Amino acid sequence: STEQSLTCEGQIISGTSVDASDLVTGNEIGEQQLISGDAYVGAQQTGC
Amino acid sequence: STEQSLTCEGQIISGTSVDASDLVTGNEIGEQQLISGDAYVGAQQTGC
Amino acid sequence: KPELVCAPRSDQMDRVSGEGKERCHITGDDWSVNKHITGTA
Amino acid sequence: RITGPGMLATGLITGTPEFR
Amino acid sequence: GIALGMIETRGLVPAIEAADAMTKAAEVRLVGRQFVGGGYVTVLVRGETGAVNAAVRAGADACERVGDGLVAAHIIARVHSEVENILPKAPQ
Amino acid sequence: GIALGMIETRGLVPAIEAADAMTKAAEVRLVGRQFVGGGYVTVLVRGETGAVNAAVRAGADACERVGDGLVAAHIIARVHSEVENILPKAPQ
Amino acid sequence: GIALGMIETRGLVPAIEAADAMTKAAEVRLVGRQFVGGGYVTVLVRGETGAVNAAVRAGADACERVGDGLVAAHIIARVHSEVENILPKAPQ
Amino acid sequence: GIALGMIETRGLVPAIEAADAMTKAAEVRLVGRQFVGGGYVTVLVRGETGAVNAAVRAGADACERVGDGLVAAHIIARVHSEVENILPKAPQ
Amino acid sequence: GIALGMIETRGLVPAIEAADAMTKAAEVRLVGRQFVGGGYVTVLVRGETGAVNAAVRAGADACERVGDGLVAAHIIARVHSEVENILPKAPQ
Amino acid sequence: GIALGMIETRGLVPAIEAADAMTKAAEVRLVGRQFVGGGYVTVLVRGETGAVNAAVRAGADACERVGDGLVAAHIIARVHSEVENILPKAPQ
Amino acid sequence: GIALGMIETRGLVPAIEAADAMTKAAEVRLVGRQFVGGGYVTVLVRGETGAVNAAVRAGADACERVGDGLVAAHIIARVHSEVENILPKAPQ
Amino acid sequence: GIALGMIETRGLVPAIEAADAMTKAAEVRLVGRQFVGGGYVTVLVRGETGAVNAAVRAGADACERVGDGLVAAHIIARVHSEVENILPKAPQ
Amino acid sequence: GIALGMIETRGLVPAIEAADAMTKAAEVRLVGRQFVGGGYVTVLVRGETGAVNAAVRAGADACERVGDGLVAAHIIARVHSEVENILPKAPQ
Amino acid sequence: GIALGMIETRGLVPAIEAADAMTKAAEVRLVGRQFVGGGYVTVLVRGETGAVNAAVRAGADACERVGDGLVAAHIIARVHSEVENILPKAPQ
Amino acid sequence: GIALGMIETRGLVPAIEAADAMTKAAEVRLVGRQFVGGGYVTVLVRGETGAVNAAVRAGADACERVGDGLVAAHIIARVHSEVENILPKAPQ
Amino acid sequence: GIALGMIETRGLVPAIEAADAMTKAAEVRLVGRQFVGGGYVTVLVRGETGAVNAAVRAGADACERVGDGLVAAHIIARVHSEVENILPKAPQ
Amino acid sequence: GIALGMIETRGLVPAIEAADAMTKAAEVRLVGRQFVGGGYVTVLVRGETGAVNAAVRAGADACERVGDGLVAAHIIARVHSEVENILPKAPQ
Amino acid sequence: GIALGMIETRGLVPAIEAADAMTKAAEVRLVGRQFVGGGYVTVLVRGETGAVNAAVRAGADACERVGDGLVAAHIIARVHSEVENILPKAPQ
Amino acid sequence: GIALGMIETRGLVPAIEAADAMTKAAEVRLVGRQFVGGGYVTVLVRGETGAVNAAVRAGADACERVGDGLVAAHIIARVHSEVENILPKAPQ
Amino acid sequence: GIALGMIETRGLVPAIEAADAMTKAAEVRLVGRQFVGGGYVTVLVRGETGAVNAAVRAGADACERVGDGLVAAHIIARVHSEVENILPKAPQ
Amino acid sequence: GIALGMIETRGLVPAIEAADAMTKAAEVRLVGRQFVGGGYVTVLVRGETGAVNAAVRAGADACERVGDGLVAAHIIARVHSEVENILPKAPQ
Amino acid sequence: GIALGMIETRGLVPAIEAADAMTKAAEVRLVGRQFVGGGYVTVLVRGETGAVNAAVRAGADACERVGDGLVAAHIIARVHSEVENILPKAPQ
């Protein structure tokens, strides 16, 4: 399943995802942090 | 619904699936018939 | 041992009827197979 | 433990004063 | 193609219906209509494994309830070279 | 390969996604995208029967949740000679 | 390889199925197919006695479930010269 | 880069705003604007996957509240060679 | 063809049986057998999508009983260009 | 022919019947008959493994219902070099 | 591109599937398949950070179901110059 | 790359820790360390948009609990041309 | 001498016992002793179908109880020409 | 060696099978086959005591259920010089 | 320095991550990577004892959750001359 | 020495106490004392990893309660070469 | 002598202890030590049948309580010539 | 010397630690490191009996809790002349 | 033969009975009778390993209830060449 | 290095054991031993802080249970210049 | 060497067993075997002091449960010149 | 030799008695007698590992009952080169 990479405003981005994965490791550091500026991750990992 | 494309003997045949899909149409004529001989579709639809 | 080397003539008709009949228990290095062996018919 | 020809026939042989 | 799909029926009418459906269904080449005897009629089509499968499934659908009906529906993806001698090369 | 696979969508974005999933899925040529009007976009793929089945099935699964959605995913294993006149030949 | 192995079936579809499985199963050269009449079809394969036995067993299993079914399965390791006149000499 | 990011909208005002946001936000090149018909306009941008994702996240937010709305936001980090035929190479 | 069919097994006897069942069942060209290590062995075949599907299905079925059985049965209808550098071209 | 096939009977009439059935059934050579004593008569045939198995099976069936009966049927595919010293080279 | 993305699996079939999904998912370069031993096979791709992150994520999802399964999926945005000596440059 | 990743910290110790993690964790190039005044220290790192995202996330977590800690972490996927005048460009 | 018989065992001691029993039973040439890895050892032999069936029975019975045990006993009366490219012809 | 090993059986078929197992098993030499009369047939082998123990055990286990059966299996490590007068020196 | 820092893991993905963290963490010189077989992968670094302690801690806690995991993390402050022959001086 | 050890204090008096404690505890060279602004004074020492660890621990304890006290004590075994551009080389 | 004794163990230390114990126990010349893989090591000796029985008993006892221990101990009183090709001649 | 001491461990790290302890404790020569397979690593030392006794005891203590663990520590005061062939002479 | 079998008894009468039973039982040569002193008498024989086992058991059993009884019955299949210096070679 | 590691023991036997353990364990140099008086022996080593930590711990462990035992084990990472007048310069 | 290892037992069987275990166990030479009288039998060896210790311990363990058992085990690392007059120079 | 043996005693009389016992017991060289102070007197011997092990054992046993007694008996099989700077070479 996927939440389809919602942006903070609520729009659904589909297709390729750079978002957090439970199977994936190495890029986990700083996943939960809310980094300001241009959005590059979903509102699921950050919670924005 | 991927499920798996199982065979009559119970082996999962992963990867590309030529089995009938709910979304797909036009390849659904006699999809559930028992065609003896070489196995081309999963036992998920035809049975054995 | 079963009383007769070969099985009763009426017990059944063999899978392969002539010179491939399994009714007679031919001991030794015959071409039969067992449970262990796969790849057979 | 140790398989081989010495394990094949059991109780069918006679005349063997094998040690132990 | 090489894959062989044969539909065996009772009587000619189901066989003609099955043959009509099979050639319409996919890219298969009707290769023969053989009178086995005793009411058996067999129609053999040749093509790719995917095409033949679509034909034999479609062809068994049409003739299942036509006349006496359908006896066997078979598909062989790759027939041994020896068997190809006992198969018709084109409908006479 | 003459088998025809088709994916229709409401909007170009799913159509491009479906065409990508199809062509990636199997060895099927992309033979055009027709703007039908009213928001519909249809992407046509031609290939071998087995390849088309895998491609169209893959394409439907990919663009189902993309944009406004998937309308139709259809397969025609063999088309009548007359119908080939109304089918695009190369991408546009 | 002079041994003779024969499989009889009801309908041509099992007969063609049996020949595919018999030739592929072991090293037997298909030698003919004969429409007995009344729905009986017989396929004869020659070869080494051991290989011919393996082929017939494989063919019987594969063709049993297909169509009307299997009627007979036979091997003759050394066919008498008088009978060689009635056997097919090669597939036509 | 070759990653493809598409944004679909109902009208040209949200499409032009999305195109402006996408090019300003990240490093992408606007490659085409398409009138799908039915009122759907698709703006396509190309670039590296990192830039394209940032661009389409900027484009989706900008055009959500402008005009009729956003229909689809899609990223294809790598498009098949065939799909590149149906995509505009540069805006005209 | 461009489709790839792989069967993974525990040991070598299932792999050889699976390879035999594939090449016999459909028109698939064996490209190699790889000793992965730890008891795994994989046999890769190439052909059209329809042929490979029939081949992989036949191979997986034939090798389930033999020995430690199979580990994976997988069809990749189209392989990307990069992956071709890690697949054997001819068996050794 | 290096394989050995032996049929043992109670009396001489079953032995000669077994020797006739064994020799006419497959390509084997009747290398000897031995009066074991106590009313047991062994008939031995040397041939190939496939031929011998067919012969002995033909022999067992033939002599099963002739005279007192069949005692033993045995095949030795490989006979050690020493064992041949206790086997007749040629029939008496 | 310098980011490194690795996927480890129990067997070669999951590894090849992961390599296919990874190379198709984003613009990443396959640089090596390693037989670690004990049935573990690792595939390394090299590309841009955004590309590798997308590639590895897709690869992990695809190969999880295939075969014994997925062991490790890892992304390293920049490897120290010392590590690169133990990293393959191109597939074997 | 033209994307900019900024981390602002209360003190210099967290700033050095952030700059260390940022530069080690991706391709990003450290460009400046500006004492804003009042205890604020800004560490600016320029690279691609994908690389900068990985670095800023690593840096932000690195200095979250070092000293007073992270004030703000910011990413600009594309910096406008004019802003580059007020941005540090020298290595220091 | 075409029929192939393979015995797979856990360890080399049960494999050598199987090879000895397989070879003693009938006229089969020992073609390969393959170390699969992970503890699997496979001994392949080749000969006439009748001899191979006798040989494999002796091997499966002889090595069943020796050491860790027997894994697989498999016979193929005729292998496809493709498979022979992956079968050892001389043991090393 | 001089250790004597004897196996007595009811009939000759058990005797030949026993002799084959004995000579195949260990380094013994077949020195005689005695027709005791009344359907008792004895096979005598001479060799070293270790070899004869293995040879006799193989012979008893091999012919235990072949034909009428086994009567006796004995091993004499050293026969008195007197007994040599009644033991055959070579078989005929 | 002369001290040695070792990290052993189950797989190659954890080993590379440990090697990456080790080299980045402190002033250590990655010397060797070993495929111990059975999944064990060893990465050895050299440097000052204080540096090695820092690196191994960074590598141990960085590679613990990736892949199967960390098996052994160990330091040797001084290494005997005899052991230097069994350690890999060259980077690979 | 390459390791970096930093202590941040609120006020200069604790910083000089920290510098005194750090430089007396181990062989660490004081590289700089920076007035960040807002009443933060950072003292940086460069030495070997062991010396830096010992010195920083002593520095934090010594100035823990002196004046306003401590803000941060941080040890970096190796700083990326790019970070060294933003570090003092000699004290001022 | 031509009798063959084999001891299979988990690890190499039990194998070396076994080989040492067997050679010292009786007249058995060590002929090979084969690494089967997966932890299995096998030591093979040749000698008279009586000697091999004593040597194998000693070797089995010696390696029973060493490390992971013993797996298989087997004696073959006579080995066929064909199996000599898969037996080490002298240890390497 | 002549005395032989072996320590077998699971993985390489325990073995390297054992080797360091053995070569530091007494005057022994590290004659070989042998990757047995499946994770087993063996280190063999040679020297005088007293020296080897101390070396192996020290090695067993050192690597007991290091990594996966110790498998076996074995001393042989004098190996047979035959065993000297299988033992290593100097390390790779 | 090298194999040595020694039986120790109290008094001479059991030794003569033990010597008699040993020699009669198997092909062992009597090499020495030794009066150790204090009533001990040791009888040594040399032969094959199998012969010595048969003899020593025969001797041990025979002399148990003769005279004072049996002290020991020891078998050494092979004695180190050094021990052969202190062993008698012919009884006196 | 300049860090000083000291071990004080009762008697010389513990001290020499500590010196051997300390020098063997880490990269430190023995600078001298002093008989304090009243059965006190102090052994001093100078080196880098990391090595001295490892050295002293090894020395304290080694000599704890030797002779009367260990009194003290101290590490001064940096000794004031004045203390160097009382410390030994080189061992005597 | 010069060290003397003496093992004393009651009877000759235990002594011969002890001489065989001693010489096989370690690198020692059997100088003699003296009949003390009253039953006691002493076996003396010579070798390095460490080798002799290993041999005697193995010798004691071997012969303590053979016959009337072990009486005395001894080692003399240096034997005075006078005692050498009363020692057996070489075995008889 | 290189191995060092050490005995510590309360007083000089046990020290001299120990020294005599060591040198008389085995071929060792007495290299020093040290007055530690407080009563302790240390006698050091150097030789082979086996010789020193015997020498120290004899020294401890003889010295135990003489005077105040024995404090320590210690061997060091290899003495690190740095530790030889604090070891007497010739006795005083």
Short mmCIF file of N, CA, C and O in Angstrom, two decimals, chain N residues 16-82:
data_model
loop_
_atom_site.label_atom_id
_atom_site.label_comp_id
_atom_site.label_asym_id
_atom_site.label_seq_id
_atom_site.Cartn_x
_atom_site.Cartn_y
_atom_site.Cartn_z
N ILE N 16 24.26 -67.56 -7.78
CA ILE N 16 24.96 -66.66 -8.68
C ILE N 16 24.84 -65.22 -8.20
O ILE N 16 25.80 -64.45 -8.25
N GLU N 17 23.65 -64.82 -7.74
CA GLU N 17 23.49 -63.48 -7.19
C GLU N 17 24.37 -63.28 -5.97
O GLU N 17 24.99 -62.23 -5.80
N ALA N 18 24.43 -64.29 -5.09
CA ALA N 18 25.31 -64.19 -3.93
C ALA N 18 26.76 -64.05 -4.37
O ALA N 18 27.47 -63.17 -3.88
N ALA N 19 27.20 -64.88 -5.31
CA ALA N 19 28.59 -64.82 -5.75
C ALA N 19 28.91 -63.46 -6.35
O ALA N 19 30.02 -62.94 -6.16
N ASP N 20 27.97 -62.87 -7.08
CA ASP N 20 28.19 -61.55 -7.65
C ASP N 20 28.40 -60.51 -6.55
O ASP N 20 29.30 -59.67 -6.64
N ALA N 21 27.57 -60.55 -5.51
CA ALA N 21 27.70 -59.60 -4.42
C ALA N 21 29.01 -59.81 -3.66
O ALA N 21 29.69 -58.84 -3.30
N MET N 22 29.38 -61.07 -3.42
CA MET N 22 30.61 -61.34 -2.67
C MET N 22 31.83 -60.82 -3.41
O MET N 22 32.64 -60.08 -2.85
N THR N 23 31.98 -61.21 -4.68
CA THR N 23 33.15 -60.77 -5.44
C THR N 23 33.14 -59.26 -5.65
O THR N 23 34.20 -58.62 -5.57
N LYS N 24 31.97 -58.67 -5.91
CA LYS N 24 31.89 -57.22 -6.05
C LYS N 24 32.25 -56.52 -4.76
O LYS N 24 32.87 -55.44 -4.78
N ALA N 25 31.88 -57.09 -3.61
CA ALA N 25 32.01 -56.38 -2.35
C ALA N 25 33.47 -56.22 -1.94
O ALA N 25 33.95 -55.10 -1.73
N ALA N 26 34.21 -57.33 -1.84
CA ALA N 26 35.54 -57.32 -1.26
C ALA N 26 36.50 -58.10 -2.15
O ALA N 26 36.10 -58.69 -3.16
N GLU N 27 37.77 -58.10 -1.77
CA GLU N 27 38.83 -58.76 -2.53
C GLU N 27 38.84 -60.25 -2.20
O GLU N 27 39.70 -60.77 -1.49
N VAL N 28 37.84 -60.95 -2.74
CA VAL N 28 37.74 -62.39 -2.62
C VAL N 28 37.77 -62.97 -4.03
O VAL N 28 37.50 -62.29 -5.02
N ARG N 29 38.12 -64.25 -4.11
CA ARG N 29 38.15 -64.98 -5.38
C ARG N 29 37.18 -66.15 -5.30
O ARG N 29 37.22 -66.94 -4.36
N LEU N 30 36.31 -66.26 -6.30
CA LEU N 30 35.40 -67.39 -6.40
C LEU N 30 36.20 -68.65 -6.70
O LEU N 30 36.80 -68.77 -7.77
N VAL N 31 36.20 -69.59 -5.76
CA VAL N 31 37.01 -70.80 -5.89
C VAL N 31 36.18 -72.04 -6.20
O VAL N 31 36.76 -73.09 -6.49
N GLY N 32 34.85 -71.96 -6.16
CA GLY N 32 34.05 -73.13 -6.43
C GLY N 32 32.56 -72.92 -6.28
O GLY N 32 32.11 -72.09 -5.47
N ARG N 33 31.78 -73.66 -7.06
CA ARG N 33 30.32 -73.69 -6.95
C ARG N 33 29.90 -75.15 -6.87
O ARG N 33 29.98 -75.87 -7.87
N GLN N 34 29.46 -75.58 -5.70
CA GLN N 34 29.18 -76.98 -5.43
C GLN N 34 27.68 -77.23 -5.51
O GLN N 34 26.89 -76.52 -4.87
N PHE N 35 27.29 -78.24 -6.28
CA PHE N 35 25.91 -78.73 -6.31
C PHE N 35 25.80 -79.84 -5.28
O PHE N 35 26.12 -81.00 -5.56
N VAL N 36 25.36 -79.48 -4.07
CA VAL N 36 25.27 -80.46 -3.00
C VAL N 36 24.19 -81.50 -3.27
O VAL N 36 24.22 -82.59 -2.68
N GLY N 37 23.25 -81.21 -4.16
CA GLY N 37 22.12 -82.08 -4.39
C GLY N 37 20.93 -81.69 -3.55
O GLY N 37 21.04 -81.09 -2.48
N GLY N 38 19.75 -82.05 -4.04
CA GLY N 38 18.53 -81.67 -3.35
C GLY N 38 18.24 -80.19 -3.37
O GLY N 38 17.55 -79.69 -2.48
N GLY N 39 18.80 -79.48 -4.34
CA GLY N 39 18.53 -78.05 -4.52
C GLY N 39 19.34 -77.22 -3.57
O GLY N 39 18.81 -76.21 -3.20
N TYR N 40 20.51 -77.67 -3.14
CA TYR N 40 21.43 -76.86 -2.31
C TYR N 40 22.61 -76.53 -3.21
O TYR N 40 23.10 -77.46 -3.82
N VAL N 41 22.98 -75.26 -3.37
CA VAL N 41 24.12 -74.83 -4.22
C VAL N 41 25.00 -73.93 -3.36
O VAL N 41 24.51 -72.89 -2.99
N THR N 42 26.27 -74.25 -3.18
CA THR N 42 27.20 -73.55 -2.31
C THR N 42 28.26 -72.84 -3.15
O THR N 42 28.76 -73.40 -4.13
N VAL N 43 28.60 -71.62 -2.74
CA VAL N 43 29.64 -70.83 -3.38
C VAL N 43 30.71 -70.54 -2.33
O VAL N 43 30.40 -70.04 -1.24
N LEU N 44 31.96 -70.85 -2.66
CA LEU N 44 33.08 -70.71 -1.74
C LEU N 44 34.02 -69.64 -2.25
O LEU N 44 34.37 -69.62 -3.44
N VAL N 45 34.44 -68.74 -1.36
CA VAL N 45 35.35 -67.65 -1.70
C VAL N 45 36.50 -67.64 -0.71
O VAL N 45 36.30 -67.85 0.49
N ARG N 46 37.71 -67.40 -1.22
CA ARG N 46 38.91 -67.32 -0.40
C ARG N 46 39.48 -65.92 -0.48
O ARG N 46 39.52 -65.31 -1.55
N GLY N 47 39.92 -65.40 0.66
CA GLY N 47 40.53 -64.09 0.72
C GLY N 47 41.00 -63.81 2.13
O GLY N 47 40.92 -64.67 3.01
N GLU N 48 41.49 -62.60 2.33
CA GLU N 48 41.90 -62.20 3.67
C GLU N 48 40.67 -62.05 4.56
O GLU N 48 39.56 -61.79 4.10
N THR N 49 40.89 -62.23 5.87
CA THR N 49 39.77 -62.35 6.79
C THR N 49 38.89 -61.11 6.77
O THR N 49 37.66 -61.21 6.83
N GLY N 50 39.50 -59.93 6.69
CA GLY N 50 38.71 -58.72 6.56
C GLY N 50 37.91 -58.69 5.28
O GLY N 50 36.74 -58.30 5.27
N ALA N 51 38.53 -59.08 4.17
CA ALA N 51 37.83 -59.08 2.89
C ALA N 51 36.69 -60.09 2.88
O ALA N 51 35.60 -59.80 2.37
N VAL N 52 36.92 -61.28 3.43
CA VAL N 52 35.90 -62.33 3.36
C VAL N 52 34.69 -61.96 4.21
O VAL N 52 33.55 -62.25 3.84
N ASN N 53 34.92 -61.34 5.37
CA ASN N 53 33.80 -60.93 6.20
C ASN N 53 32.89 -59.96 5.46
O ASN N 53 31.66 -60.07 5.51
N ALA N 54 33.49 -58.99 4.76
CA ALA N 54 32.69 -58.08 3.95
C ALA N 54 32.02 -58.81 2.79
O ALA N 54 30.85 -58.57 2.50
N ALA N 55 32.76 -59.70 2.13
CA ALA N 55 32.20 -60.40 0.97
C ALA N 55 31.02 -61.27 1.36
O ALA N 55 29.99 -61.28 0.68
N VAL N 56 31.14 -62.01 2.47
CA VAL N 56 30.07 -62.91 2.87
C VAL N 56 28.84 -62.12 3.30
O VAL N 56 27.71 -62.50 2.98
N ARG N 57 29.04 -61.02 4.02
CA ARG N 57 27.91 -60.21 4.45
C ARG N 57 27.16 -59.64 3.25
O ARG N 57 25.92 -59.58 3.25
N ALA N 58 27.89 -59.21 2.22
CA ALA N 58 27.24 -58.73 1.01
C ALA N 58 26.46 -59.84 0.32
O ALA N 58 25.35 -59.62 -0.16
N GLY N 59 27.04 -61.04 0.27
CA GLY N 59 26.36 -62.14 -0.40
C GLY N 59 25.09 -62.56 0.31
O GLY N 59 24.07 -62.82 -0.32
N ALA N 60 25.13 -62.64 1.64
CA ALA N 60 23.93 -62.99 2.40
C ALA N 60 22.85 -61.93 2.23
O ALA N 60 21.68 -62.26 2.04
N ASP N 61 23.23 -60.66 2.29
CA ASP N 61 22.24 -59.59 2.17
C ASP N 61 21.68 -59.51 0.75
O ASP N 61 20.49 -59.21 0.57
N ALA N 62 22.45 -59.85 -0.27
CA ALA N 62 22.03 -59.72 -1.69
C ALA N 62 21.07 -60.83 -2.09
O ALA N 62 20.10 -60.51 -2.78
N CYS N 63 21.32 -62.07 -1.69
CA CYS N 63 20.52 -63.25 -2.06
C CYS N 63 19.52 -63.67 -0.97
O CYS N 63 18.86 -64.68 -1.17
N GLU N 64 19.41 -62.93 0.13
CA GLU N 64 18.52 -63.31 1.26
C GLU N 64 17.12 -63.57 0.73
O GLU N 64 16.55 -64.58 1.16
N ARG N 65 16.59 -62.73 -0.17
CA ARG N 65 15.23 -62.86 -0.68
C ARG N 65 15.18 -63.20 -2.16
O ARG N 65 14.08 -63.24 -2.73
N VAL N 66 16.31 -63.40 -2.83
CA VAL N 66 16.34 -63.80 -4.26
C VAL N 66 15.95 -65.26 -4.34
O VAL N 66 16.55 -66.06 -3.62
N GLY N 67 14.95 -65.59 -5.14
CA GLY N 67 14.51 -66.96 -5.37
C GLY N 67 14.08 -67.71 -4.14
O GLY N 67 13.37 -67.12 -3.33
N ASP N 68 14.46 -68.98 -4.04
CA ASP N 68 14.01 -69.85 -2.93
C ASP N 68 14.60 -69.32 -1.63
O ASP N 68 13.96 -69.53 -0.59
N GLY N 69 15.80 -68.75 -1.66
CA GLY N 69 16.35 -68.07 -0.48
C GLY N 69 17.74 -68.48 -0.10
O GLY N 69 18.42 -69.02 -0.96
N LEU N 70 18.13 -68.23 1.16
CA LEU N 70 19.47 -68.48 1.65
C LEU N 70 19.41 -69.53 2.75
O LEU N 70 18.52 -69.48 3.60
N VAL N 71 20.36 -70.47 2.73
CA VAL N 71 20.41 -71.51 3.74
C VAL N 71 21.44 -71.20 4.81
O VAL N 71 21.15 -71.27 6.01
N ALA N 72 22.66 -70.83 4.41
CA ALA N 72 23.73 -70.62 5.37
C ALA N 72 24.74 -69.64 4.80
O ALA N 72 25.05 -69.65 3.61
N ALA N 73 25.37 -68.86 5.67
CA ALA N 73 26.47 -67.95 5.30
C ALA N 73 27.47 -68.10 6.41
O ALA N 73 27.12 -67.66 7.48
N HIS N 74 28.64 -68.69 6.18
CA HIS N 74 29.65 -68.97 7.23
C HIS N 74 30.98 -68.34 6.85
O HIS N 74 31.09 -67.97 5.70
N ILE N 75 31.86 -68.07 7.80
CA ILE N 75 33.24 -67.59 7.52
C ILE N 75 34.20 -68.41 8.38
O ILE N 75 33.94 -68.48 9.57
N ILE N 76 35.22 -69.03 7.80
CA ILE N 76 36.27 -69.74 8.52
C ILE N 76 37.57 -68.99 8.25
O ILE N 76 38.03 -68.93 7.10
N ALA N 77 38.16 -68.43 9.30
CA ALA N 77 39.35 -67.60 9.11
C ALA N 77 40.56 -68.44 8.72
O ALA N 77 41.38 -68.00 7.91
N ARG N 78 40.68 -69.64 9.28
CA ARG N 78 41.78 -70.54 8.94
C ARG N 78 41.24 -71.96 8.92
O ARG N 78 40.81 -72.48 9.96
N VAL N 79 41.25 -72.59 7.76
CA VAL N 79 40.81 -73.97 7.61
C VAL N 79 41.99 -74.90 7.85
O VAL N 79 43.12 -74.61 7.42
N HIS N 80 41.74 -76.01 8.54
CA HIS N 80 42.80 -76.98 8.77
C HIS N 80 43.26 -77.57 7.44
O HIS N 80 42.48 -77.72 6.49
N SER N 81 44.55 -77.90 7.37
CA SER N 81 45.11 -78.42 6.13
C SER N 81 44.35 -79.64 5.63
O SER N 81 44.29 -79.89 4.42
N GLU N 82 43.76 -80.41 6.55
CA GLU N 82 42.97 -81.57 6.14
C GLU N 82 41.77 -81.15 5.30
O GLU N 82 41.46 -81.78 4.29
#
